[PDB]
Design a protein around this ligand. Structure first.
Ligand SMILES: [Mg+2]
Lengths: 325, 292, 243, 111, 34, 222
RNA sequence: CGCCGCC
RNA sequence: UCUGGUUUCUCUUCAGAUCGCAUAAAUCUUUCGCCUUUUACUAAAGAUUUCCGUGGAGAGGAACAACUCU
């Protein structure tokens, strides 16, 4: 939070290295996801020109995204039993439920794989299905984000068809992992990708006399006030609300200034939500200053981290993701 | 939530009841309503993740002790019926102590702690034997420091001399209820009731913190020092020294002992997949325990 | 003490504190320019010599003149002081040395020699026997009562400085650039070194105004009129032998 | 456009305002009003061409050195706010590109 | 400073200070009172 | 010599009643967030100002310098501005919002917000300005111990079966204003102390250490 | 967000 | 049954404390700002004092000290 990073920076400056240190404007780690499924199917190439893994990526539901995010399923279980878990929970298909392998980031992050939407037998020969090259290749290729080097989350990829090398000791057996990476998020970026900002749950306690001031100072910062609760005991009482972590900067100071020190708030990480806008958009004019309250602050919010440590812009799917021959 | 996710022993010491009653100035029955509400809310909040459905908390289980750290009072009834006992009681507490919460006492027929109100305005036993006498100590010391305070000191049997009675009203309060309540007996009896006093609750602990290790590490981590086991001691924290550049790490010992400069096999977060990629084994002959 | 002292012709004597690099005492009372100063090595006073005729005992911590040593008739070019009696030695521009009582203030013994003025005295610091400097005939004395031990050879410029090392070598620095090494024991003029000027200065501007050995006494470093500090060292040979 | 010069004119005009006031041994706020200076000599008085009462502009000081930002937060220039509104000198001086566009058409019409 | 700017030396220059706000700005939403 | 004084609580509660009209109703140092002395020390050290606070002169940290490639590499019109960094944020905690701070002090953080119902009526625990969501007269959802009023009288010795007090009530005339005086300002929560000089006591001094009430002229706020 | 006051 | 002292006045060193729940003036050393030169000045930093006061300590009385803490 703010105060944690304050005490970090104080101990960094005046205790552990007494050289003067420039800081930057605070900004959040933010995340990537998809909104609906694909509108085209992917394509592959290896240096042997041997593979063709064509596939898609579709969303999940947010509750099970939290579930696999919070170790509700574990990889140590029985294959049929975790299949039964996801089967009887998400009313999933029976043949595809047991077909899974290890999950997304850290094998815990909700970017799971299902091999078997489209029919059960193609190859199964030596690799033939995703065992170590594509699993660890996805691990190596899901922590480094596709669209603006920020992680995907709550988007699952399902392989539709593929092929093995003739003898992957001789031909490509370690030369399909970067193709696997490239294919998976090629299928991601064609599917209308979106970003996710974190929200903070904020709990205010505040006297009743200055309680519309907190409505104004979080409503200005895009805050959905959920619960105003007169509490027993304290005449001051609680507000519970949601604010973006990019608009939480100087929050409790602003709140505590407008209420002349009577109100007080605390702030904690809630689950991620969708920024108003699309990263893929072009013909979209971003003034350098003047923050957007607009429905297109997401394009700003991603180009201004590609303008950072970043990459080059213009992420339309022609060059590194696809091949219009 | 993070504690029962680690299934630790969730006991509770709710605090600032002086701030409940010197400051919000609640009548005793409504103070009981607030405390019953807050214990019911933490009970219904613990029973949101019901792997331990039997485990609830109440004062009668010796599971919650009230307090005021401003004036240093321990409270709870298993320790308070001791102060009923050592002066003028001969009560034989912990059956009397587990009887005063949520049931109504009445003065004739000398005791039947009913489920009903004998008189149409009958305060409970918690707001006739324990809470409202605390009100009378507290209100008579911060309202009547000149009159009626030697009467309540003569009744409570606390002599207190001319120098220490000339204090300001807040330190005088802290001293008078410190000499009344004595020592923190409620906080240690709340820990006889729970907090499983290790090698007894060590099984979910060593299960959750270690990765398995049955027949190699599990049975010896369940054991104590008795110096035949491994060393195998955890370390989560790293305090600074006064000069700052020296760090002193800090953690719990589970089965073993360190004396005088033992070579120390320092594991790491990903140094040991099955074996140490690095240790940099250390020789440390100073280590000592911490207070504030 | 952790502070240095300074004095110059602005009539000012200052106590530069070294922990802050700033003036803290700023002594006052000299009626003309201020030439030399020296610290008593044991107690905390400060003896200063001027152009008017006098020398003063400033009390450090009080910045109060304990004594004005009024016994000369012209400028007082230099002053050294020590722990053993006699305490203070003032060599002046009226051709005389005199040796003072630090307590009573009166002079113990004046030393009339030196047809031309004395401008440098130095003490040894192992045994007794200080030595004085003048254009005629650099001499050498002996501390209780003053006693003419010896005069030294013909270093015949108007000399400015004397410095002595703990192993008996002694450097006399003069106003025409020439500086003569000696020994304490005999009086044998040893080296007779005359240095050059650094490019801008004209030929007749070499002259030595200060010389001081190191605490190691391996380095002899002289402040000269050529706006230059010259730093000297030994030489590790054997065959420059005595005649 | 030169903001650093508009700070200088406010700084220098007030300094000769003050230099005349210390010649009277005055320096006082209302013992020497700005009627005295800005009244033309034909009535009497000193008669001086103001550029200080101008409301010198500002911008965001963080982002000032970075980028042409625009304009915010007019800073008050000379210390006179009672609604006298002494005229600038700049509005009686015909600007340059207007003067050259007059020059082109006037010599064209004259030929 | 409400937010950002002013003058660190009010006694250097021949002014009193008091930055206003630029009342001639053009945008969509600014206010706090109505 | 008139050096020391000890009063009694009626004698001081009447003085505390008489000494209004120049005594502040602030119960805690929570009105003074970013009007504290340490917030002002930080504002002095950082050349900036809280609105309505003092404006000092800069100190030895006058002019900074960064060459063009370096501050151009760190800071372009690249960063995600959402809402501006006000100076109250920098004075609040001057380390992550402010590069190179020194000679700087670090302010207090949220004293625990005393509520303290004030009184106008007898019967001390009047229980007002306070909701209560706990359902009265009908509740059980947890198991209680001793759910069996069965054991008759054996161990409640009637010599001291009684509570710790019944000889005096839980309230009287001078326990309302006593606990009102418990939360008093600085001279009036004492009951005892020393004697101050008559010029030592600042009267109009909690007054300026506040905000200015709005609707006041420019002369009185400067 | 409001310098200034002279022997 | 015996033990048995608060005020008030003068001296006697120690002060490490918001010695003071507030807060003066000076000197020095630098940077400011007005400035023509010098004192009157400006308003920041550093280090020093003076001054208006206080705290604990030895002694001498006198003040009901014989009321009585003990
Ligand atoms: Mg003259």
């Amino acid at each position: 939070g703010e105060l944690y990073l304050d005490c970090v920076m104080h101990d960094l400056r005046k205790m552990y290295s007494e050289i003067d240190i420039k800081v930057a404007d605070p900004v959040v780690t933010f995340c990537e996801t998809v909104v609906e499924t694909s509108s085209l199917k992917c394509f592959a190439e290896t240096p042997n020109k041997k593979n063709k893994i064509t596939m898609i990526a579709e969303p999940l539901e947010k509750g099970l995204a939290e579930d696999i995010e919070n170790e509700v399923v574990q990889i140590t279980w029985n294959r049929k039993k975790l299949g039964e878990f996801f089967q009887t929970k998400y009313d999933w298909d029976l043949l595809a439920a047991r077909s899974i392998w290890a999950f997304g980031p850290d094998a815990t992050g909700p970017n799971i794989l299902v091999d078997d939407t489209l029919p059960s037998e193609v190859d199964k020969a030596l690799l033939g299905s995703v065992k170590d090259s594509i699993v660890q290749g996805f691990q190596w290729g899901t922590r480094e984000g596709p669209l603006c080097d920020e992680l995907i989350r709550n988007v699952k990829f399902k392989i539709l068809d593929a092929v093995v090398a003739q003898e992957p000791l001789h031909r490509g057996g370690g030369q399909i992992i970067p193709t696997a990476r490239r294919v998976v998020y090629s299928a991601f970026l064609m599917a209308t990708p979106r970003l996710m900002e974190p929200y903070y749950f904020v709990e205010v306690q505040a006297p009743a006399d200055c309680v519309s001031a907190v409505y104004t100072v979080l409503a200005r910062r895009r805050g959905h006030v959920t619960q105003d609760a007169p509490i027993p005991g304290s005449p001051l009482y609680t507000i519970k609300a949601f604010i973006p972590a990019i608009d939480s900067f100087g929050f409790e100071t602003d709140l505590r200034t407008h209420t002349q020190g009577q109100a007080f708030s605390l702030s904690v990480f809630h689950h991620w939500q969708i920024v108003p806008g699309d990263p893929l958009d072009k013909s979209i004019v971003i003034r350098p200053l003047e923050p957007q309250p607009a429905p297109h602050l997401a394009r700003e919010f991603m180009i201004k981290t590609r303008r950072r440590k970043g990459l080059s812009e213009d992420v339309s799917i022609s060059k590194f993701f696809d091949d219009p021959m | 939530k993070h504690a029962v996710q680690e299934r630790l022993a969730v006991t509770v010491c709710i605090n600032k009841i002086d701030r409940l009653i010197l400051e919000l100035k609640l009548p005793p029955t409504d103070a009981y309503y607030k405390l019953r509400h807050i214990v019911d809310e933490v009970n219904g909040l613990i029973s949101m993740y019901s792997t331990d459905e039997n485990l609830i908390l109440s004062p009668l289980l010796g599971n919650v002790c009230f307090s005021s750290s401003q004036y240093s009072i321990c409270f709870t009834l298993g320790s308070f019926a001791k102060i009923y006992a050592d002066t003028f009681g001969d009560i034989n507490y912990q059956e009397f102590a587990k009887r005063l919460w949520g049931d109504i006492y009445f003065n004739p027929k000398t005791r039947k702690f009913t489920k009903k109100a004998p008189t149409s305005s009958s305060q409970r036993s918690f707001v006739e034997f324990i809470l409202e006498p605390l009100y009378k100590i507290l209100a008579q010391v911060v309202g009547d420091v000149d009159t009626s305070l030697p009467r309540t000191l003569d009744e409570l049997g606390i002599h207190l001399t001319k120098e220490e009675l000339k204090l300001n009203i807040r330190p005088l309060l802290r001293l008078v209820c410190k000499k009344f309540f004595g020592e923190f007996t409620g906080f240690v009896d709340m820990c006889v009731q729970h907090i499983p006093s290790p090698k007894v609750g060590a099984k979910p602990k060593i299960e959750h913190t270690y990765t398995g290790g049955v027949d190699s590490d599990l049975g010896e981590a369940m054991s104590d020092c008795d110096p035949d086991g491994p060393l195998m001691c955890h370390t989560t924290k790293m305090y600074s020294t006064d000069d700052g550049v020296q760090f002193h790490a800090f953690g719990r010992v589970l089965s073993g002992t360190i004396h005088a400069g033992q070579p120390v096999k320092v594991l790491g977060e990903n140094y040991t997949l099955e074996d140490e990629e690095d240790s940099q084994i250390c020789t440390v002959g100073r280590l000592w325990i911490s207070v504030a | 003490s952790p502070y240095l002292f300074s004095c110059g012709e602005d009539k000012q004597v200052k106590c530069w504190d070294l922990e802050y690099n700033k003036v803290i005492r700023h002594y006052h009372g000299h009626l003309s320019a201020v030439y030399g100063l020296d610290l008593h090595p044991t107690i905390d006073v400060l003896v200063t010599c001027s152009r008017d005729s006098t020398a003063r005992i400033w009390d450090v911590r009080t910045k109060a003149s304990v004594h004005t040593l009024s016994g000369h008739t012209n400028a007082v070019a230099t002053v050294r002081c020590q722990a053993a009696e006699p305490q203070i030695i003032t060599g002046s521009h009226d051709t005389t040395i005199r040796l003072w009582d630090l307590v009573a203030g009166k002079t113990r013994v004046t030393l009339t020699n030196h047809k031309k003025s004395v401008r440098a005295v130095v003490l040894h610091p192992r045994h007794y026997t200080f030595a004085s400097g003048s254009p005629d005939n650099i001499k050498q004395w002996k501390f209780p009562d003053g006693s003419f031990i010896q005069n030294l050879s013909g270093h015949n410029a108007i000399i400015n400085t004397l410095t002595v090392n703990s192993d008996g070598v002694l450097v006399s620095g003069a106003d025409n650039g020439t500086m003569h090494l000696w020994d304490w024991r005999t009086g044998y003029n040893f080296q007779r070194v005359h240095a050059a000027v650094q490019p801008g200065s004209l030929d007749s501007e070499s002259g030595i105004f200060a010389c001081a050995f190191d605490q190691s006494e391996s380095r002899l470093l002289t402040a000269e009129a050529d706006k230059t500090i010259k730093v000297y060292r030994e030489d590790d040979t054997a065959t420059e032998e005595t005649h | 456009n030169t903001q650093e010069l508009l700070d200088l004119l406010v700084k220098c005009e007030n300094k000769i305002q003050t230099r005349i006031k210390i010649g009277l041994n005055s320096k006082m706020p209302s013992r020497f009003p700005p009627v005295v200076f800005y009244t033309p000599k034909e009535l009497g008085g000193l008669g001086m061409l103001s550029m200080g009462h101008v409301l010198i502009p500002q911008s965001d000081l963080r982002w000032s050195k970075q980028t042409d930002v625009g304009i915010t937060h007019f800073r008050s220039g000379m210390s006179h706010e009672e609604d006298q509104l002494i005229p600038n000198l700049y509005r009686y001086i015909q600007p340059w590109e207007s003067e050259f566009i007059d020059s082109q058409r006037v010599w064209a019409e004259y030929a | 400073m409400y937010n950002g700017i002013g003058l660190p030396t009010p006694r250097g220059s021949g002014t009193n200070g008091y930055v206003q706000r630029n009342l001639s700005l053009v945008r969509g939403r600014r206010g706090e009172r109505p | 010599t008139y050096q020391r004084w000890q009063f009694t609580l009626p004698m001081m509660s009447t003085l505390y009643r008489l000494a209004n009209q120049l005594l502040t109703d602030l119960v805690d140092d929570n009105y003074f967030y970013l009007f504290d002395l340490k917030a002002f020390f930080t504002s002095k050290a950082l050349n900036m100002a809280i609105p309505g606070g003092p404006k000092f002169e800069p100190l030895v940290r006058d002019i900074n310098l960064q060459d063009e490639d370096w501050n151009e590499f760190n800071d372009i019109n690249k960063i995600i501005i959402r809402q501006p960094i006000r100076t109250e944020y920098k004075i609040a905690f001057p380390y992550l919002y402010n590069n190179l701070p020194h000679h700087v002090h670090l302010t207090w953080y949220h004293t625990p917000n005393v509520v303290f119902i004030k009184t106008e009526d007898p019967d001390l625990p009047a229980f007002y300005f306070d909701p209560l969501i706990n359902p009265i007269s009908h509740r059980h959802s947890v198991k209680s111990q001793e759910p069996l009023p069965d054991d008759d009288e054996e161990f409640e010795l009637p010599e001291f079966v009684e509570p710790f007090l019944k000889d005096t009530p839980l309230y009287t005339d001078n326990t309302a204003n006593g606990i009102a005086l418990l939360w008093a300002p600085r001279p009036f929560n004492l009951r005892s102390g020393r004697t101050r000089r008559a010029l030592d006591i600042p009267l109009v001094k909690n007054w300026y250490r506040e905000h200015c009430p709005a609707g006041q002229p420019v002369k009185v706020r400067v």
